[PDB]
Structure 1
Amino acid sequence: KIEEGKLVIWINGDKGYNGLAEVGKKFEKDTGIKVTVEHPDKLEEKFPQVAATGDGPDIIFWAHDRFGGYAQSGLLAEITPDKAFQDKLYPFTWDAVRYNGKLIAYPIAVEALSLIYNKDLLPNPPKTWEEIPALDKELKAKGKSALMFNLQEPYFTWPLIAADGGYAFKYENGKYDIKDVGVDNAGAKAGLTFLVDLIKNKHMNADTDYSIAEHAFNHGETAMTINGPWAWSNIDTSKVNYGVTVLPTFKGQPSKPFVGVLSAGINAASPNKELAKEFLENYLLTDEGLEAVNKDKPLGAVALKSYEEELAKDPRIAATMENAQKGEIMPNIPQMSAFWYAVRTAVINAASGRQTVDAALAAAQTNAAA
């Protein structure tokens, strides 16, 4: 069972967990309460299982999309920031963590995928997806490749799927229609078909995952990658001369990455709710707190106004916001877990040649819908 008198925190391991731990040490120094930061694998799936039994972390960090489901299942404590605190963050970030009229998590940062490119290999990155095959031919002749990114998680291919018409659930007047899924319209099909053609024509490998893409980019094996702000720190360390820019267009339309608000929720089963509120409100969501995390691994555009105002001048953040503006904020509805699983299956099956793009997305639509 969750222990009283300490805080256990779960956060994805590609985020600045060491920096978050620094905020934890500061918390312990002031309160005597020990803070343990952990990054279990597949934490976003482990949470619902263990929290159901009254176990797991006091605080869970994830993009807001998963939180509606946690809330519907009664896994989250309703949070109680007063009016002064709420005023400290951008109103739209609060909207992302609202579910059935209740705030169920604290917004931290706004994430969106960007095109990352090696300036020495590619001083002028492609403006369109359509340009990528020829770049790859040219680079292959130098023992390099044009583009590598994670093909195991649908999050990374979604921008291309959505670019020319793909969407998750139809949204009208502040309500998602869970029976109206947009993963199998002409736009979605066109997008995935292009991705699969890249693979068939040997410009990408269906096996490529996050670690393989990161290694390749950071070692100058590939000219481009697609990734979030968290990834910039490792590139800095690699001494690759990189730029961050708008994603390529597809059929003349911008790529539309799903926008995630990194959020922190409080386990409904936690006997440490007040401590968790104190930690999140008085320590983490301050200029000093977000600074420590961000210095470890960049957060992106933070929810805290005072600190975003000082990050805003960073061109990498301007590119992130530009890509966010072109994309869409993720739904937070409970149906999202089913949506993602359906799209992951379709992309893997189509990329590997197990099913046609059309069969893959037709099953995803059915699987995702109610």
Structure 2
Amino acid sequence: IEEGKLVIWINGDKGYNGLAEVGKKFEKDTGIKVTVEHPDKLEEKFPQVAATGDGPDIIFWAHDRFGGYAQSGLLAEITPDKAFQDKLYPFTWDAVRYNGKLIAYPIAVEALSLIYNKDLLPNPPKTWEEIPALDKELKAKGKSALMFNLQEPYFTWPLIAADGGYAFKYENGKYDIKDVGVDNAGAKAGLTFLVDLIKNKHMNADTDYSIAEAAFNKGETAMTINGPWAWSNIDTSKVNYGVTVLPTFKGQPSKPFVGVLSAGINAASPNKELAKEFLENYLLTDEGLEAVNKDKPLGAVALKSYEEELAKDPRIAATMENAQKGEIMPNIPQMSAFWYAVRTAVINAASGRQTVDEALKDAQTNAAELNGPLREEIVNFNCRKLVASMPLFANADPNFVTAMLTKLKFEVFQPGDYIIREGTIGKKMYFIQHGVVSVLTKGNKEMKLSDGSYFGEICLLTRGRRTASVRADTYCRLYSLSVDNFNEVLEEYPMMRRAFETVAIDRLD
């Protein structure tokens, strides 16, 4: 971030080129440059980087992650006046409330639908249960019935929820965080049906977003499950598609988790006023949303004036029908733990790492018990110890140490793994969070290092070989810090760079 410009983050499946057009209009009027970026794992990156001088001015995501960001102090309260508020649907404003405060601008309402190829399947099935029979019929003609993203639990959730699965029980206007529904009869039946699809070769566990998109848009599968954003690429592929009600499971509708694409203002931004002006006066207008919608459809927009037009589209009416059979996602801080829990369970069940019963038992405990803030805190202090213990960093500015912590990468090694091999060239030093290693120098004396220690640091000043091998003696958990990332932070703190250069200037004598 820098004062006088806007950096916006939005997910790579959304209309980021269209948003950049809105930004080009903004720059033309104010001289303020707008850069739109779509980094991978943006929703996880944002809370890591936002405090530490990095991060976008504006973050776009579904509202479910914003309670967490709000809890962490990473979002500015927004202050639209009543007239502006009246422009958007009251339920969209509700979705972005935390402690009664508005913490983001709602943009669009998202739900998943069944997308079907009308040439391959003129009458799409009404039930999940008839998909195996349909796939066998299609397999004989070199096709498949259904492919969709099995790596993201968002896509499998409607099935899980259909017969009674739920995230957190809603009662008397509030979520009971101790009452998780991911291990109940309904959730187990849903995921069992999905795993049986996999086991009987009607779907593949490795299927991700790209695979399913490419299969449906090339005409290889009769159906997919996706949201409005995906419709552009299907239009471009020329497939004759319909958008309809998701299939029923055990006679019960699929229950997609409804998301409200929302735009938050990073509390670290020096551009909060410019961010408000862009969001209120440029993006949230008929012209602004249209530019984004034209690139990748937004869904049912929060802006009433524009939604009046979009609601005439039967694809948007199918989206809202699915949405009404679903549930608005909670925005509570525990949602991150929930998603992490269900993601691992679905991946483990589908692959056969665990049974459905085992995977979901562990998901229940993870979603209910896991304390993100507490675990984050413990992880951050321990990393801070490791980095600040090293002689080089022993008297450095605490913010320098803090920026450096964000660069650390988690690595694991098995007994007998060489972390560093003598004669090779590395670009990383290592800190030992947990484990024992041997430092071996050809023939010689071993030296054993353990929890708290470090090694490989000479790559910070060498551009040269590894002069010793380092072998894991037990299971090791390490953090690595690369010379590039070290330099990058060292450039952000010029007083430290000068100190370290004067050190190196004397190390030549």
Greater relative contact order: 1 or 2 (C-alpha under 8 angstroms, separation 6 or more)? 1
Instruction: Give me the whole-angstrom Cα distance separating, in 2, the residues matched to 1:108 and 1:270.
Output: 20
Deviation per CA, 1:25-83: give whole Å up to 9, x if none.
00000000000000000000000000132321000000000000000000000000000
- SS, match of residue 107 in structure 1: strand
- SS, match of residue 254 in structure 1: coil
Deviation per CA, 1:143-202: give whole Å up to 9, x if none.
000000000000000000000100000111221111110001000000000000000011
Tell me how many residue pairs correspond in the alignment. 368
Instruction: Give me the whole-angstrom Cα distance separating, in 2, the residues matched to 1:320 and 1:139.
Output: 27
Q: How does 1:101-250 map to 2 (within 5 A)?
A: 101-250=100-249
Instruction: Give me the whole-angstrom Cα distance separating, in 1, the residues matched to 2:163 and 2:51.
Output: 39
Deviation per CA, 1:338-369: give whole Å up to 9, x if none.
00000000000000011110000000000000
- SS, match of residue 322 in structure 2: helix
* Poorly superposed stretches of 4+, deviation over 3 Å: none
Matching residue of 2:290: 291
Higher-Rg member (1/2): 2
Matching residue of 2:491: none
CA positional deviation for 1:134: 0.4
- SS, match of residue 121 in structure 2: coil
1:42 aligns with 2:41: yes
- SS, match of residue 236 in structure 1: helix
Instruction: Give me the whole-angstrom Cα distance separating, in 2, the residues matched to 1:312 and 1:222.
Output: 28
Deviation per CA, 1:207-239: give whole Å up to 9, x if none.
000000000000000000000000000000001
Structure 1 stretch 71-80 or stretch 48-57: which is displaced more? 48-57
Instruction: Give me the whole-angstrom Cα distance separating, in 1, the residues matched to 2:141 and 2:185.
Output: 36
Structure 1 stretch 82-91 or stretch 167-176: which is displaced more? 167-176
Instruction: Give me the whole-angstrom Cα distance separating, in 2, the residues matched to 1:189 and 1:363.
Output: 13
Instruction: Give me the whole-angstrom Cα distance separating, in 2, the residues matched to 1:202 and 1:351.
Output: 12
Structure 1 stretch 165-174 or stretch 57-66: which is displaced more? 165-174
Percent identical residues? 99
Q: What root-mean-square deviation, in Å, do the aligned CA atoms of Structure 1 and Structure 2 show?
A: 0.4
CA positional deviation for 1:136: 0.1
Instruction: Give me the whole-angstrom Cα distance separating, in 2, the residues matched to 1:117 and 1:126.
Output: 10
Structure 1 stretch 197-206 or stretch 50-59: which is displaced more? 50-59
Deviation per CA, 1:119-157: give whole Å up to 9, x if none.
000000000000100000000000000000000000000
Instruction: Give me the whole-angstrom Cα distance separating, in 2, the residues matched to 1:145 and 1:288.
Output: 40
Matching residue of 1:360: 359
Instruction: Give me the whole-angstrom Cα distance separating, in 2, the residues matched to 1:149 and 1:164.
Output: 20
Instruction: Give me the whole-angstrom Cα distance separating, in 1, the residues matched to 2:299 and 2:143.
Output: 29
Instruction: Give me the whole-angstrom Cα distance separating, in 2, the residues matched to 1:281 and 1:38.
Output: 20
Deviation per CA, 1:62-120: give whole Å up to 9, x if none.
00000000000000000000000000000000000001110000000000000000000
- SS, match of residue 52 in structure 1: coil
Instruction: Give me the whole-angstrom Cα distance separating, in 2, the residues matched to 1:59 and 1:7.
Output: 8
Instruction: Give me the whole-angstrom Cα distance separating, in 2, the residues matched to 1:65 and 1:129.
Output: 27
Q: Which runs of 5+ in 1 are unaligned?
A: none
Deviation per CA, 1:259-316: give whole Å up to 9, x if none.
0000000000000000000000000000000000000000000000000000011000
Instruction: Give me the whole-angstrom Cα distance separating, in 2, the residues matched to 1:282 and 1:54.
Output: 27
Instruction: Give me the whole-angstrom Cα distance separating, in 2, the residues matched to 1:54 and 1:126.
Output: 51
Instruction: Give me the whole-angstrom Cα distance separating, in 1, the residues matched to 2:53 and 2:284.
Output: 27
Instruction: Give me the whole-angstrom Cα distance separating, in 2, the residues matched to 1:264 and 1:25.
Output: 18
- SS, match of residue 50 in structure 2: helix
CA positional deviation for 1:258: 0.2
Instruction: Give me the whole-angstrom Cα distance separating, in 2, the residues matched to 1:269 and 1:210.
Output: 32
Q: Which runs of 5+ in 2 are unaligned?
A: 369-509
Instruction: Give me the whole-angstrom Cα distance separating, in 2, the residues matched to 1:55 and 1:68.
Output: 20
- SS, match of residue 3 in structure 1: coil
- SS, match of residue 59 in structure 2: strand
Matching residue of 1:329: 328
Matching residue of 1:30: 29
Instruction: Give me the whole-angstrom Cα distance separating, in 2, the residues matched to 1:54 and 1:95.
Output: 30
Instruction: Give me the whole-angstrom Cα distance separating, in 1, the residues matched to 2:316 and 2:309.
Output: 11
- SS, match of residue 168 in structure 2: strand
